[PDB]
Amino acid sequence: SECVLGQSKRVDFCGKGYHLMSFPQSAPHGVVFLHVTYVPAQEKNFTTA
Amino acid sequence: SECVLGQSKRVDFCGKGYHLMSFPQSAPHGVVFLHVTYVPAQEKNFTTA
Numbered sequence: 843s844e845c846v847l848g849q850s851k852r853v854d855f856c857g858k859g860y861h862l863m864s865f866p867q868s869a870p871h872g873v874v875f876l877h878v879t880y881v882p883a884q885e886k887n888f889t890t891a
Numbered sequence: 892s893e894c895v896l897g898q899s900k901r902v903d904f905c906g907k908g909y910h911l912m913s914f915p916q917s918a919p920h921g922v923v924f925l926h927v928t929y930v931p932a933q934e935k936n937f938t939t940a
């Protein structure tokens with residue numbers, strides 16, 4: 843109800859990282875979610891104020 | 892997962908009041924959370940439109 847039909851703001855609920863979309867495939871006696879996320883990769887530091 | 896590793900917008904979940912931070916101390920056969928909050932204290936009333 844939450845991850846598929848909308849965007850989830852709860853941290854580490856519908857996937858490790860920031861949440862974008864989900865896809866609900868079926869399976870024998872169960873369901874399999876495919877979560878799509880967004881993870882920063884390359885970082886660089888600066889001086890702030 | 893939710894209160895510590897991020898901020899929570901859920902009401903009355905990670906502490907009474909608006910939520911800021913939490914620290915997860917340990918304890919035998921359990922765990923103890925310390926929640927920081929934010930409570931408005933004084934009041935003053937006016938007329939609006």
Ligand SMILES: *[C@@H]1O[C@H](CO)[C@@H](O)[C@H](O)[C@H]1NC(C)=O
Pocket residue numbers: 887888
């Ligand atoms: C940025 O972080 C690196 C650590 O990998 C550090 O050596 C460097 O001094 C930092 N940048 C500045 C401007 O200090």
Ligand SMILES: *[C@@H]1O[C@H](CO)[C@@H](O)[C@H](O)[C@H]1NC(C)=O
Pocket residue numbers: 936937938
């Ligand atoms: C503000 O609230 C008090 C109740 O404590 C009331 O007596 C007062 O008339 C109110 N002031 C205004 C401007 O509504």
